[PDB]
Amino acid sequence: MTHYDVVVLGAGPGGYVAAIRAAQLGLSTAIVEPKYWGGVCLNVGCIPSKALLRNAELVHIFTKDAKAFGISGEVTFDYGIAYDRSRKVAEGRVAGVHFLMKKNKITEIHGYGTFADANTLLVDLNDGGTESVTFDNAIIATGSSTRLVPGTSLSANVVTYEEQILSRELPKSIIIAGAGAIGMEFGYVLKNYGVDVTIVEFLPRALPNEDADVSKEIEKQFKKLGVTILTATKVESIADGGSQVTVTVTKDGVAQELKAEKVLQAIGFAPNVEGYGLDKAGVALTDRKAIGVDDYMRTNVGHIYAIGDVNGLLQLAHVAEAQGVVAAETIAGAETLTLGDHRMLPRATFCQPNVASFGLTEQQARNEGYDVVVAKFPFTANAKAHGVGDPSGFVKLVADAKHGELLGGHLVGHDVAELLPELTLAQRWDLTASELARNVHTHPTMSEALQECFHGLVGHMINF
Amino acid sequence: MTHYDVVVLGAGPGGYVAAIRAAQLGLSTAIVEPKYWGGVCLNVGCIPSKALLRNAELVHIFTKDAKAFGISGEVTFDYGIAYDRSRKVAEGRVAGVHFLMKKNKITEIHGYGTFADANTLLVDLNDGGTESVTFDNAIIATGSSTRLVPGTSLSANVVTYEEQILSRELPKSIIIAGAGAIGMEFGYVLKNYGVDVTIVEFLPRALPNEDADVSKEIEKQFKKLGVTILTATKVESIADGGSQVTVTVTKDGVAQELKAEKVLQAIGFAPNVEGYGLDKAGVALTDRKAIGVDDYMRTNVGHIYAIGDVNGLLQLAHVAEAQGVVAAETIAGAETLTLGDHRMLPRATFCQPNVASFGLTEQQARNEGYDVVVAKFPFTANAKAHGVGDPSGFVKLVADAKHGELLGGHLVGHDVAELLPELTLAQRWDLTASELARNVHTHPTMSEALQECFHGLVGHMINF
Numbered sequence: 048m049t050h051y052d053v054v055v056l057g058a059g060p061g062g063y064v065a066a067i068r069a070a071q072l073g074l075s076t077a078i079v080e081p082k083y084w085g086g087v088c089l090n091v092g093c094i095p096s097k098a099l100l101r102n103a104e105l106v107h108i109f110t111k112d113a114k115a116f117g118i119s120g121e122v123t124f125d126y127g128i129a130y131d132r133s134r135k136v137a138e139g140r141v142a143g144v145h146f147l148m149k150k151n152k153i154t155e156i157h158g159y160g161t162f163a164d165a166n167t168l169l170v171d172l173n174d175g176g177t178e179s180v181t182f183d184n185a186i187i188a189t190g191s192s193t194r195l196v197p198g199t200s201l202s203a204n205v206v207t208y209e210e211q212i213l214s215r216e217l218p219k220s221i222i223i224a225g226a227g228a229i230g231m232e233f234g235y236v237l238k239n240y241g242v243d244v245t246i247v248e249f250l251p252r253a254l255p256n257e258d259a260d261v262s263k264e265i266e267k268q269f270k271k272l273g274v275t276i277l278t279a280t281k282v283e284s285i286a287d288g289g290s291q292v293t294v295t296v297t298k299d300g301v302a303q304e305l306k307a308e309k310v311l312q313a314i315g316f317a318p319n320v321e322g323y324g325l326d327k328a329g330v331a332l333t334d335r336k337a338i339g340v341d342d343y344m345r346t347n348v349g350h351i352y353a354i355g356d357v358n359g360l361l362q363l364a365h366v367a368e369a370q371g372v373v374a375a376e377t378i379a380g381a382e383t384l385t386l387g388d389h390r391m392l393p394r395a396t397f398c399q400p401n402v403a404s405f406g407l408t409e410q411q412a413r414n415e416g417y418d419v420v421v422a423k424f425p426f427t428a429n430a431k432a433h434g435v436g437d438p439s440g441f442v443k444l445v446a447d448a449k450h451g452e453l454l455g456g457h458l459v460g461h462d463v464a465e466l467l468p469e470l471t472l473a474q475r476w477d478l479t480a481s482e483l484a485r486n487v488h489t490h491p492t493m494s495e496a497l498q499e500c501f502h503g504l505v506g507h508m509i510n511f
Numbered sequence: 512m513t514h515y516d517v518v519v520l521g522a523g524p525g526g527y528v529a530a531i532r533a534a535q536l537g538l539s540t541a542i543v544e545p546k547y548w549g550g551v552c553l554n555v556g557c558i559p560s561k562a563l564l565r566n567a568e569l570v571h572i573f574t575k576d577a578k579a580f581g582i583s584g585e586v587t588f589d590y591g592i593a594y595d596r597s598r599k600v601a602e603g604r605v606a607g608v609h610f611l612m613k614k615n616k617i618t619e620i621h622g623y624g625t626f627a628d629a630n631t632l633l634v635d636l637n638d639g640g641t642e643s644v645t646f647d648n649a650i651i652a653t654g655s656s657t658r659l660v661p662g663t664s665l666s667a668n669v670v671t672y673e674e675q676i677l678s679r680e681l682p683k684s685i686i687i688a689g690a691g692a693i694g695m696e697f698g699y700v701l702k703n704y705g706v707d708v709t710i711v712e713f714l715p716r717a718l719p720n721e722d723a724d725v726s727k728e729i730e731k732q733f734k735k736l737g738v739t740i741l742t743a744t745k746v747e748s749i750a751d752g753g754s755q756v757t758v759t760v761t762k763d764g765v766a767q768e769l770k771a772e773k774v775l776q777a778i779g780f781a782p783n784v785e786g787y788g789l790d791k792a793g794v795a796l797t798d799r800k801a802i803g804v805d806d807y808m809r810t811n812v813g814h815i816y817a818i819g820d821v822n823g824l825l826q827l828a829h830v831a832e833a834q835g836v837v838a839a840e841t842i843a844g845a846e847t848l849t850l851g852d853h854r855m856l857p858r859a860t861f862c863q864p865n866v867a868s869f870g871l872t873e874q875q876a877r878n879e880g881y882d883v884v885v886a887k888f889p890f891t892a893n894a895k896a897h898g899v900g901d902p903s904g905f906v907k908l909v910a911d912a913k914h915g916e917l918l919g920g921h922l923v924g925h926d927v928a929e930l931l932p933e934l935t936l937a938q939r940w941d942l943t944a945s946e947l948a949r950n951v952h953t954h955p956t957m958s959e960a961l962q963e964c965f966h967g968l969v970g971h972m973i974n975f
């Protein structure tokens with residue numbers, strides 16, 4: 048039936064952006080989405096959570112630091128309003144997507160898509176109808192879905208980020224499976240609102256993907272916040288009894304029964320790869336059930352690309368958009384530039400203090416065989432940190448002794464997730480610590496912490 | 512009979528930092544300071560003021576968005592406590608300075624220095640003594656002082672940043688002369704604490720040194736705050752009546768009276784150049800009554816350098832430090848790098864929303880015959896901005912069409928002062944919009960605004 052130069056499956060951060068880039072390159076484009084315009088990110092992930100995170104932060108300040116700031120008076124916080132605001136922000140962002148589609152003359156198709164042929168797509172319109180769509184190129188951005196603990200299932204008390212982020216009421220207590228960004232974030236929010244929070248992690252450290260120093264620090268903050276985190280603990284089963292939930296866990300042989308009114312499943316996310324004829328299109332998967340892809344987001348099938356979480360490279364919004372652009376451009380044959388080693392891409396957990404990082408960890412760089420060089424500067428020695436009321440955290444940078452090329456960056460502190468830009472730019476365009484050390488940073492700011500690390504990397508730090 | 516390889520006048524940011532770099536380079540160093548160790552910045556400038564801006568920010572967040580965040584109850588902010596914190600933060604930084612002086616084996620000389628020769632310094636010790644010190648090199652970092660309005664004088668109710676920032680009690684009202692960073696910052700603090708603030712600016716724009724777009728925006732914010740700003744108005748005279756101060760001003764060829772309990776004078780700062788025998792050393796001044804220097808902070812006298820506000824290039828703390836390094840490095844004969852066109856150096860106003868900028872403004876870049884290219888991006892289209900509860904402001908970039916080289920950056924919004932690093936690094940190391948547009952930014956962050964501008968600079972944006 049209808050035909051288009053390019054058709055994207057999914058309107059998440061990766062899908063709607065790849066669609067825009069395709070449109071900007073003069074390519075007839077259409078996007079197929081049945082539910083979430085803006086994907087999980089805008090509707091029930093990035094956007095809404097960051098809103099709640101901010102609310103939780105203020106509850107923290109006007110509580111634990113009220114006296115330190117000369118604040119008096121009895122004050123209370125209604126999570127309901129927090130919830131409502133988060134939904135409003137999301138709602139506004141979603142509206143933006145539809146605007147962008149209209150502005151770029153991108154055709155929207157409201158329904159579920161299924162590959163019938165290598166260049167045909169059968170769509171189940173949300174109105175009940177059904178239309179066939181031919182395409183010379185296709186971009187799969189179907190995202191991913193939360194992976195539950197083997198043997199367990201979702202119920203009224205055992206939920207995923209989705210059902211939890213849409214709850215206007217909070218439980219008296221909760222048990223979170225997974226100490227990843229998403230798990231830590233909910234822990235921060237919930238705890239700040241009076242919910243007893245226990246976080247269980249199979250690996251030996253919270254935020255295991257991060258550098259060991261970062262994990263150790265963020266664990267200090269959470270324990271200080273009142274959150275109970277259990278590492279090297281394995282979740283055996285989750286039994287929802289109605290009045291409460293019993294999660295059996297094991298650690299070094301000993302097994303105990305943890306009970307809470309609710310349990311959030313967040314151990315990981317597995318790409319959505321089944322149910323829409325990926326096999327009929329010819330697209331192959333990986334040993335990890337992820338869509339195989341090359342440096343150009345291209346799949347085993349030439350005209351079919353896979354971007355976003357569906358390829359499991361780095362399940363993060365900005366990555367999905369980045370791959371989307373690389374997908375569209377390469378399709379149009381226009382100038383593009385592969386992202387390269389996806390480990391060099393930035394990431395951040397938005398609890399307070401923030402956790403931001405990129406590249407390899409100290410240990411990682413070592414095992415890799417590089418001539419590792421490390422510099423670490425505490426925020427207790429930063430003026431801005433003291434002025435804002437959060438002197439915690441630090442900036443740890445990793446480079447190679449040869450010419451001083453950055454290998455990675457690991458930060459923890461007040462909104463440090465904004466300090467990554469300079470680092471990645473330098474690593475991507477080969478700017479050594481020597482050049483970084485000659486860049487003047489405004490005073491007084493958190494960024495100065497980076498400047499000192501640049502100095503400690505090259506020669507000696509000044510204000511330390 | 513004491514002699515040193517290098518002698519530093521003034522212990523402000525540039526001073527003590529210069530002394531530090533010198534020591535690190537194995538140079539016998541001594542620093543002369545009679546009053547403020549850490550200079551105006553750590554004692555009554557940067558440091559203390561930033562802390563006060565943080566308290567004011569929290570007062571603004573509550574009084575205006577308390578319900579928007581679901582905060583219920585009535586609280587009170589005690590400025591006296593805010594004041595006490597600012598002093599603690601300050602004394603902490605000062606104490607740190609002495610630490611670095613000892614750590615680097617730098618000799619502290621407590622007293623006022625006066626030149627007698629090009630290699631001899633007479634010192635009026637604070638203990639009443641009077642000794643002399645010789646040197647092979649000298650670094651003049653005597654900072655600046657408040658330039659009063661012609662014909663006016665200081666008094667009990669007519670003060671400068673020093674008396675103001677050091678007062679624990681607040682006035683019922685105040686008139687601030689000068690809409691520069693310092694003036695605007697004080698307005699914000701005082702207003703948020705219940706004071707009736709009126710700011711008078713000779714020029715037709717607040718923050719006239721910034722880009723017109725930024726000035727307009729910041730002017731709108733302050734109006735909503737309740738701050739009265741009179742631009743294109745000249746202060747004719749200030750009469751301290753004891754129980755009331757009268758400020759005669761002229762706007763539209765018509766003189767009129769403005770009255771308040773106090774009046775802050777902050778129209779500008781003049782480099783400290785007299786009273787310490789600069790002529791005895793034979794150091795020349797510019798037509799602006801500032802110590803002349805070359806790209807290496809070198810004065811007309813070969814072994815005499817001047818850094819900081821004293822040279823009036825760019826009166827800021829990071830600038831002073833950066834110049835100190837170049838100075839000390841040049842003396843020691845170590846590899847260095849000139850800062851270059853000081854106009855490209857970053858600056859920021861720490862009121863909320865912040866104001867951050869660097870390089871040329873749009874109009875300046877045009878007047879200088881550049882093939883100007885601009886890219887603006889609003890924060891209302893930024894996910895993080897909504898999450899934080901302040902989508903106001905924007906990011907304006909200006910570049911040259913030749914190769915997409917950056918000429919200037921002008922931002923306004925939530926703590927945007929932390930977003931300059933990437934921009935100045937690129938401008939300093941010939942990275943263009945094209946390389947900048949290929950740098951992925953963590954989502955969702957304020958820095959994503961930069962990323963959009965980069966795109967709209969190389970061609971077309973994405974989320975707008």
Ligand SMILES: Cc1cc2nc3c(=O)[nH]c(=O)nc-3n(C[C@H](O)[C@H](O)[C@H](O)COP(=O)(O)OP(=O)(O)OC[C@H]3O[C@@H](n4cnc5c(N)ncnc54)[C@H](O)[C@@H]3O)c2cc1C
Pocket residue numbers: 056057058059060061062079080081082083084085086087088089091092093094096158159160161188189190191208212229319322323354355356357362363364365366367395397953954955
């Ligand atoms: C609570 C939470 C917080 C997060 N916080 C962050 C953060 O701070 N930063 C960050 O970078 N990432 C964050 N993430 C992750 C981020 O949301 C994902 O990385 C991102 O959404 C992936 O984008 P995507 O476009 O690949 O897919 P998704 O956004 O998952 O979108 C896929 C879309 O495709 C549609 N679809 C699927 N199959 C079909 C089909 N067959 N036909 C038609 N449509 C289909 C779906 O309905 C869906 O809307 C967070 C996630 C969660 C759950």
Ligand SMILES: Cc1cc2nc3c(=O)[nH]c(=O)nc-3n(C[C@H](O)[C@H](O)[C@H](O)COP(=O)(O)OP(=O)(O)OC[C@H]3O[C@@H](n4cnc5c(N)ncnc54)[C@H](O)[C@@H]3O)c2cc1C
Pocket residue numbers: 489490491520521522523524525526543544545546547548549550551552553555556557558560561622623624625652653654655672676693783787818819820821826827828829831861
């Ligand atoms: C209220 C206020 C807020 C500010 N906020 C900021 C901000 O947020 N960010 C920013 O970057 N800048 C800010 N500034 C500006 C910043 O403080 C100055 O740019 C910086 O202090 C200049 O450093 P300096 O070393 O040149 O001189 P100063 O710090 O002024 O120090 C000069 C020192 O020299 C000493 N001295 C003078 N003559 C002699 C002599 N003959 N012998 C011995 N010692 C002598 C003095 O006693 C003094 O301590 C602010 C300034 C004020 C007033």
